[PDB]
Write a protein that binds this ligand. Structure first.
Ligand SMILES: Nc1ncnc2c1ncn2[C@@H]1O[C@H](COP(=O)(O)OP(=O)(O)OP(O)(O)=S)[C@@H](O)[C@H]1O
Ligand SMILES: Nc1ncnc2c1ncn2[C@@H]1O[C@H](COP(=O)(O)OP(=O)(O)OP(O)(O)=S)[C@@H](O)[C@H]1O
Ligand SMILES: Nc1ncnc2c1ncn2[C@@H]1O[C@H](COP(=O)(O)OP(=O)(O)O)[C@@H](O)[C@H]1O
Ligand SMILES: [Mg+2]
Ligand SMILES: [Mg+2]
Ligand SMILES: [Mg+2]
Ligand SMILES: [Zn+2]
Lengths: 647, 645, 245
DNA sequence: TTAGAGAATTGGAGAGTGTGTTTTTTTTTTTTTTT
DNA sequence: CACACACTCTCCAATTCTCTAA
């Protein structure tokens, strides 16, 4: 038998209080929630976000005038699933009639309403039928309590404290909690059925079946009164037209590396977003998901197979992300600060020296626009450098400021197919596709195998990576700007040896790079002293030794690229002339020098010069490409070439 | 159930006699009440009382023997007595509408002396079944914490009444009862529909760790044996793999083991496992004390007194490995590595590691591996690794499948388990190149990344690696640069703070000194042993389970470990300008010097200088770095690079 | 089955056996035993028709090398034979008796026989207070011209020693000499299986044809010879076994 | 031959005995032949 | 383990049948 227990909650009084709250609450138009229900009746909104701050304010207001409440906020944070049904029932009771001419072109549910009502009425006079969830066209959610900063939050308001996946103990099941973590795997949207709309071949009667079990059994038996009394034994046919579906997405939230105790492994927690919250979560997110932590049961046969050990999921209710005024601000900064010399030092404030490398990194960050083909607007630079030089620090600084920027190493791109056996997903990405409209910081570029060599070669002159797993020949758009940080083999760079001999990169791949910098360290007497002072100051004060203008926000570069991308600075005819004689004399001096053959100016150097000039004008208003721009571009190109011949 | 009531009242009398347990229950209750009345707080004390078995034996020997011999009949009554005691003396506050329904029985934990029950997973035979035993060993696997149902509370929306239902399993309750199919009752007795009330039900966490005997305890010629403990509630997540542990619990069996028609001659046995009641974390290889050794006020006073010595660094260093003659600078570097520099979690994602890495490359038989073994035996958390016997998967993470839950899971490798510890990689150069990229990544950014089997995580490996390597040839060749002597890439040698080169130069005075020292070492006789008697080991030091100016030349190893723990926990040195002057002067001198042309000096040596100076500041217990700290760090680094003195 | 009893061109055949109560933990892998058992039958459900897996139910085990451990990690020597050993130890020519009885068929090689006696007895293990231990086992290498009876000496040492494993350098791998990580067919869980240097724990392992070992296999013996521990970090396992060989 | 009182049989629901699942080969070592 | 399927065991009232009915 089932015993009985005494619990002081009194659901009926709570329901009366709930109805009073939905009727008699007006935030400091009429009532807020009545206005929301009016909008719902107009079919202009299908999300009743029941805030808990509002319920707390309602309780506080009625505390001074009768205390006509039973701590609802503390009564639904303990059991939220039942109160979702209570709120839905209270909304159906107080649902206002529409106050708008809503088109009813697709009124299948209304058609079923009136049809079944007429069929019942023609015999009711003898001359609930509809499930409560079937009629609802809204989804109800809970917004957790905000910060209290008062004695009310005396360790209470468990939905106020963002927990981690490890701290979600088993005794929180059924409560309305919130977790903080990084999404890792969000599934595709699937229509989860809430109530089926079986129709019988005879007897005319359709019987509905509410289901929340992840698995059900079709009725297929006309148990209707007419069918049973006539013993027709009719079978039932599903009608997806008259059924009710809710979009279902099954996310999965991990925990941040700062929440994991030492020696442990990050945990994970399944999230079941459904309703209007679908597609609000993506794998590259850090969120504070608020939901009801519920024990999904192993209903079926593995049920008896396992036992009391349940599996849990978080029925998400509210997702809070963490991650022309700006145009005026950046315009004013342009007027005040010299972008050319300021943004360069802003990229790597904690990295001393190598200013021209930073200037080239600005051009890569902006990049010219030459989408028209006959070509490409992606700037690629490689820093051959030297062991012990802060190439990796520069790469990380670029990654942390460049939108859609990723950092990766040669030895641990490409792509993998169908990683999980169960779901059997198709065409999982890699590292180059993630930085589609961004930059890939390929550290240890020399130590990167032939497969990735071919992959990056395809990406570099195709902007689209492809696979040939099972003859599908599918491709992934990866228009990523490439930033390489290869380092010389046999340790330190040898200036005497030829540059391509020092690093195991084929001349075919290196020659396609728009600009190349060889930036090696030399033991000096003053540069090292300033470097040591800088690093030690950073260690003391945890902040850079600020000695000049150091802008921080990257939105200025975003504004510049978005501004001049539509502008597309058109090159001048005199510019084209000066660059054709520039190529002529460059090739002439390349011959007369031939010392290292890693120079012969090539059509690709002209394309790189054009795109660098385009990027420079793209930074400075529109159509600024003139002699002034091309002189700086050619100066940068010549300096980069000379860098290969340093000392 | 007259016997049940008799046991309950006898244990109530015992609890009344020894008022310390009542005081502990009162303390737990007031702590919970104050936390409930007082915010970003989650520290709630569990409903668990640790009773000493010695007190129970002295009070009622019959009850004590019943607990130790047939706990399935004596522990439930004692737990019920404890629950009744806590309820009677409870402050009877206002209900929270959940504690009334959610059961919170007061569990019991035991300590004290066990005698014949102080066992190990190898010596845990079938004659110990259904008895309360304590097993000591190393945790190797830990299942995922998965909540399990023990009571479901239902609300019938037709009578306004609440109906519950208790659930029992073989792994939850000691006494055997009819298992429940774990299906919620969807209909009442009187044809009423019921809705399950989550949040008024009761779920308890459930974990299944695996404890195996210590590898050094295994008999000659056999691999360690393991047992499976089933921790639940407050004892979940108390242990992680690699932890030396001492689990107290009831050695239970389950199943029909054949005897089910399906098996007539089949000769399989029953599934046996321990229902853990207590987890006591003995650690640090000292066989009886925790890794975080308790610090008495006398010990802290003595530590502070010794920190004032002018040559505390020399005393601590020379006291590290007294059996290893010479290698004073390597000992100093090892001690500095034991208390690593402060770790800087800068903004914009920057992260400056505070762990010191030491590489020792040199001629054979120069105590390169005995120093590693000593670091293993001394550091609070050290993991032994060898070049040949370790793969990248075995060093970072292995994608295995959980057996308790049946799903894919990551298992921490040998160099994630050593998080916040040290890794002693012996025979470093023998590692295969495919298995060397992993340690390169870890020493680079101190986190491993996993991208296999549809798993994308980033485990934390903040370990300081000390490695011993051999030259490319048999012995170090002074006629070649220190690049072709070592078979490792410079991109990997750059991650080692100190690269000590040891040479077995053949002298005559030094050879005499070393021979005399080694012969003195080989004549050592243990205190409780006769001459010419083999040194048998029993390690049966488990007499009890649970917690039951000055200028010395050499400090004892346990005191050295206490000092290291105190220095790591307490003092967090901060850099100072007076030390930075020395640091920058020495770095500039080292960089642009003719003799240092062969040296690989880069900007990393500056960070090494800062880390060594901060470590030496930790040695002095000074909360700030001084000129002497930077001077000593510079001298040590100069010896590591040049080696003149 | 005994290697000298297998038929011509046949692999050795295994046989599942069951102990019970006081006959358990009585033998260790590698020991040669004589069993008095009941050749019984059980139908394991794991591929013909009406087939039955055979096994022996042990009723008595008569090893020749003592029980688990050596003499069960203690002395199980009858008083008469202990007195015999004491009488033997007082023999003034005990060294010559032991030397002359090491491979009596090998002419000469007196020094190698003396070194083999020293190897069989072994040194004395020490464990210092600071933690580091000093091994007490002797390793002997026999270089020389072919036909000098090195392999015969190794084969005899494999007999006289209470615990011994004979392996050839050619047919021997690093994971098969120290410890092999294997996957359990049923439970899908990795576990270790001891190699030659674990089977010969507490004894001597004779590695014939030493110079034929692959360069990456001979290295695995470096730790197990001096430190006398085998460190494994593979497939989520992290243990430091013991090999006092 | 017709509207109506008697025998005689057997199909459609249900008591019940025994079934049938969930249930898995990924990833990681170790070997071996070519490369 | 238990819920759902397939099916042997088992069983009375509506459906057929032939002696006595109109
Ligand atoms: N110009 C610089 N300014 C500040 N810190 C620097 C500078 N150059 C080097 N460093 C320091 O050098 C370290 C980072 O150097 P890395 O970029 O790792 O050298 P590396 O050339 O990448 O080494 P690898 O792995 O052989 S490529 C950090 O400790 C930096 O603080
Ligand atoms: N001094 C000896 N006394 C007796 N028999 C001997 C002696 N020297 C050699 N032999 C015999 O000569 C053969 C030597 O073969 P092995 O000893 O097996 O090979 P080996 O001596 O190890 O040389 P290897 O292995 O090819 S380097 C055996 O048949 C021995 O019995
Ligand atoms: N400086 C030293 N002082 C004392 N003993 C030493 C010293 N160097 C080597 N030994 C002895 O050499 C033996 C083996 O040393 P080991 O750790 O194998 O060195 P490696 O690993 O470099 O070969 C040890 O037992 C140790 O006692
Ligand atoms: Mg780098
Ligand atoms: Mg060594
Ligand atoms: Mg031979
Ligand atoms: Zn029908």
């Amino acid at each position: 038998a089932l015993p009985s227990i005494q619990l002081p909650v009194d659901y009926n009084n709570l329901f009366n209080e709930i109805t009073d709250f939905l009727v008699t609450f007006k935030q400091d138009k009429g009532p807020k929630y009545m206005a929301m229900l009016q909008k719902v009746a107009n079919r202009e909104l299908n999300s009743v976000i029941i805030d808990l701050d509002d319920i707390l304010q309602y309780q506080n207001e009625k505390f001074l005038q009768g205390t006509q409440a039973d701590d609802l906020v503390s009564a639904i944070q303990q059991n939220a699933n039942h109160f979702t049904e209570l709120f839905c029932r209270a909304i159906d009771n107080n649902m206002p009639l529409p106050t708008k001419e809503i088109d009813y072109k697709d009124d299948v549910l209304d058609v079923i309403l009136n049809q079944r009502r007429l069929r019942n009425e023609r015999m009711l006079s003898d001359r609930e039928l509809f499930p409560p969830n079937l009629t609802r066209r809204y989804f109800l959610y809970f917004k957790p309590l905000s910060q209290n900063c008062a004695r009310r939050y005396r360790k209470k308001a468990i939905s106020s404290k963002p927990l981690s996946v490890r701290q979600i103990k088993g005794d929180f099941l059924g409560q309305l909690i919130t977790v903080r973590g990084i999404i890792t795997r969000v599934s595709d949207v699937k229509p989860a059925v809430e109530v089926i709309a079986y129709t019988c071949d005879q007897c005319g009667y359709e019987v509905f079946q509410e289901v929340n079990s992840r698995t059900f059994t079709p009725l297929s038996e006309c148990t209707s009164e007419e069918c049973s009394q006539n013993q027709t034994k009719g079978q039932l046919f599903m009608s997806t037209r008259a059924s009710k579906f809710s979009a279902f997405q099954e996310c999965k939230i991990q925990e941040l590396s700062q929440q994991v105790p030492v020696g442990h492994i990050p945990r994970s927690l399944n999230i079941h977003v459904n309703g209007t919250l679908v597609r609000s979560l993506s794998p590259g997110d850090i969120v504070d998901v608020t939901g009801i932590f519920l024990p999904a049961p192993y209903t079926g046969f593995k049920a008896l197979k396992a036992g009391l050990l349940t599996e849990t999921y978080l029925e998400a209710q509210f997702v809070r992300q963490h991650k022309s005024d700006v145009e005026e601000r950046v315009m004013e900064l342009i007027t005040s600060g010299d972008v050319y010399n300021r943004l360069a030092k802003s990229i790597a404030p904690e990295i001393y020296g190598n200013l021209d490398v930073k200037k080239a990194l600005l051009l890569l960050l902006v990049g010219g626009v030459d989408k028209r083909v006959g070509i490409r607007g992606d700037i690629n630079v490689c820093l051959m450098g030297d062991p012990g030089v802060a190439k990796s620090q520069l790469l990380k600084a670029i990654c942390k400021i460049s939108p859609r920027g990723v950092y990766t190493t040669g030895k641990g791109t490409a792509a993998v197919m169908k990683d999980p056996v169960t779901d059997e997903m198709i065409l999982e990405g890699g590292a180059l596709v993630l930085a589609d409209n961004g930059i890939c910081c390929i550290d240890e570029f020399d130590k990167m195998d032939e497969s990735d060599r071919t992959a990056i070669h395809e990406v570099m002159e195709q902007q689209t990576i492809s696979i040939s797993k099972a003859g599908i020949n599918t491709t992934l758009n990866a228009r990523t700007s490439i930033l390489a940080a290869a380092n010389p083999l046999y340790g330190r760079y040898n200036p005497r040896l030829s540059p391509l001999d020092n690093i195991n990169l084929p001349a075919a791949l290196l020659s396609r790079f728009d600009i190349l910098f060889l930036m090696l360290d030399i033991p000096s007497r003053d540069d090292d002293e300033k470097l040591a002072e800088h690093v030690t100051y950073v260690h003391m004060h945890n902040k850079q030794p600020d000695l000049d203008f150091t802008p921080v926000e990257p939105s200025k570069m975003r504004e510049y690229i978005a501004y001049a991308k539509t502008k597309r600075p058109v090159m001048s005819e005199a510019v084209n002339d000066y660059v054709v004689q520039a190529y002529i004399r460059l090739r002439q001096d390349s011959k007369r020098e031939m010392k290292f053959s890693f120079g012969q100016a090539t059509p690709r150097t002209l394309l790189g010069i054009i795109r660098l000039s385009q990027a420079l004008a793209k930074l400075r208003l529109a159509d600024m490409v003139d002699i002034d721009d091309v002189e700086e571009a050619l100066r940068l190109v010549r300096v980069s070439k000379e860098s290969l011949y340093q000392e | 159930d007259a016997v049940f009531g008799d046991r309950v009242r006898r244990f109530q009398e015992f609890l009344d006699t020894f008022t310390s347990y009542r005081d502990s229950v009162r303390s737990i209750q007031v702590y919970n009440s104050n936390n409930a009345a007082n915010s970003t707080s989650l520290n709630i004390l569990p409903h668990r009382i640790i009773i000493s078995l010695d007190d129970l034996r002295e009070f009622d020997r019959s009850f004590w023997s019943g607990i130790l011999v047939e706990p399935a009949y004596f522990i439930p009554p004692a737990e019920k007595a404890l629950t009744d005691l806590a309820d009677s003396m409870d402050d009877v506050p206002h209900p929270n509408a959940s504690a009334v329904s959610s059961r919170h029985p007061w569990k019991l934990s035991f300590k004290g002396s066990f005698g014949a029950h102080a066992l190990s997973p190898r010596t845990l035979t079938a004659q110990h079944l259904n008895k309360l035993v304590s097993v000591e060993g190393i945790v190797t696997k830990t299942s995922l914490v998965r909540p399990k149902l023990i009571r479901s509370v239902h609300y019938a929306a037709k009578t306004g009444r609440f109906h519950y239902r208790d659930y029992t399993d073989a792994t939850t309750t000691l006494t055997t009862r009819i298992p429940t199919p774990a299906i919620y009752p969807t209909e009442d007795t009187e044809g009423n529909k019921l809705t399950t009330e989550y949040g008024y039900s009761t779920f308890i966490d459930h974990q299944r760790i695996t404890v195996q005997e210590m590898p050094e305890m295994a008999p000659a010629g056999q691999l360690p044996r393991s047992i499976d403990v089933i921790l639940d509630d407050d004892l979940v997540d108390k242990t992680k793999p690699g932890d030396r542990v001492n689990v107290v619990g009831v050695f239970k069996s389950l199943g029909a083991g054949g005897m089910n028609q399906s098996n007539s001659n089949t000769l399989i046995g029953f599934k046996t496992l321990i229902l853990g009641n207590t987890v006591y974390p003995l650690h640090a290889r000292s066989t009886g004390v925790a890794a975080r050794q308790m610090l008495t006020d006398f010990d802290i006073r003595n530590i502070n007194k010794l920190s004032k010595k002018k040559d505390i660094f020399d005393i601590l260093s020379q006291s590290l490995a007294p059996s290893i003659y010479g290698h004073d600078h390597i000992k100093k570097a090892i001690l500095l590595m034991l208390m690593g520099g402060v770790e800087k979690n800068l903004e914009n994602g920057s992260h400056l590691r505070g762990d010191i890495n030491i590489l020792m490359v040199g001629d054979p038989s120069t105590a390169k591996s005995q120093l590693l073994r000593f670091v293993l035996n001394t550091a609070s958390l050290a993991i032994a690794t060898t070049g040949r016997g370790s793969s990248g998967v075995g060093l970072t993470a292995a994608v295995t499948t959980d057996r308790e839950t049946g799903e894919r899971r990551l298992e921490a490798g040998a160099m994630v388990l050593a998080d916040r510890g040290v890794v002693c990689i012996d025979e470093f150069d023998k590692m295969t190149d495919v298995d060397r990229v992993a340690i390169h990544e870890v020493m680079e950014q101190q986190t491993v990344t996993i991208a296999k089997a549809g798993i994308h995580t980033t485990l934390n490996a903040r370990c300081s690696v000390i490695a011993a390597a051999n030259p490319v040839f048999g012995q170090y060749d002074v006629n070649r640069d220190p690049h072709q002597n070592i078979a490792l890439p410079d991109s990997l040698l750059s991650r080692f703070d100190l690269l000590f080169v040891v040479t077995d130069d053949i002298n005559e005075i030094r050879d005499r000194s070393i021979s005399e020292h080694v012969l003195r070492t080989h004549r050592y006789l243990p205190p409780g042993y006769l001459e010419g008697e083999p040194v048998r080991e029993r390690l049966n030091l488990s007499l009890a389970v649970g917690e039951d100016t000055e200028i010395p030349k050499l400090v004892t190893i346990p005191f050295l470990r206490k000092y290291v723990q105190y220095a790591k926990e307490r003092v967090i040195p901060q850099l100072t300008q007076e030390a930075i002057n020395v640091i920058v002067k020495n770095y500039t001198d080292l960089r642009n010097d003719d003799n240092t042309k062969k040296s690989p000096i880069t900007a990393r040596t500056l960070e090494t200088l800062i880390r060594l100076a901060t470590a030496h500041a930790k040695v002095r217990l000074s909360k700030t770095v001084n000129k002497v700290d930077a001077k000593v760090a510079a001298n040590l680094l100069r010896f590591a690079l040049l080696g003149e003195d | 089955e005994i290697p000298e009893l297998v038929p011509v061109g046949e692999m050795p055949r295994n046989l599942t056996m069951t102990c019970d109560r006081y006959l358990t933990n009585k033998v260790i892998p590698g020991t040669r035993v004589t069993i008095v058992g009941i050749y019984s039958i059980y139908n394991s459900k794991n591929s013909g028709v009406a087939i039955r897996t055979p096994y022996i139910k042990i009723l008595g085990i008569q090893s020749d090398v003592e029980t688990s451990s050596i003499w069960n990690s203690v002395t199980m020597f009858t008083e008469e034979e202990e007195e015999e050993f004491l009488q033997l130890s007082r023999n003034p020519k005990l060294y010559e008796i032991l030397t002359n009885s090491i491979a009596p068929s090998i002419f000469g090689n007196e020094d190698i026989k003396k070194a083999i006696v020293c190897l069989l007895m072994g040194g004395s293990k020490k464990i210092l207070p600071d933690g580091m231990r000093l091994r007490g086992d002797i390793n002997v290498l026999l270089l020389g011209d072919p036909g000098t009876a090195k392999s015969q000496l190794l084969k005899f040492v494999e007999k006289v020693s209470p615990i011994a494993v004979y392996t050839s350098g050619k047919g021997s791998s690093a994971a098969g000499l120290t410890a092999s990580v294997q996957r359990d067919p049923m439970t899908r869980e990795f576990y270790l299986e001891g190699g030659a240097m674990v089977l010969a724990d507490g004894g001597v392992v004779c590695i014939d044809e030493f110079d034929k070992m692959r360069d990456e296999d001979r290295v695995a013996i470096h730790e197990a010879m001096e430190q006398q521990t085998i460190s494994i970090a593979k497939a989520g396992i992290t243990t430091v076994l013991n090999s006092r060989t």
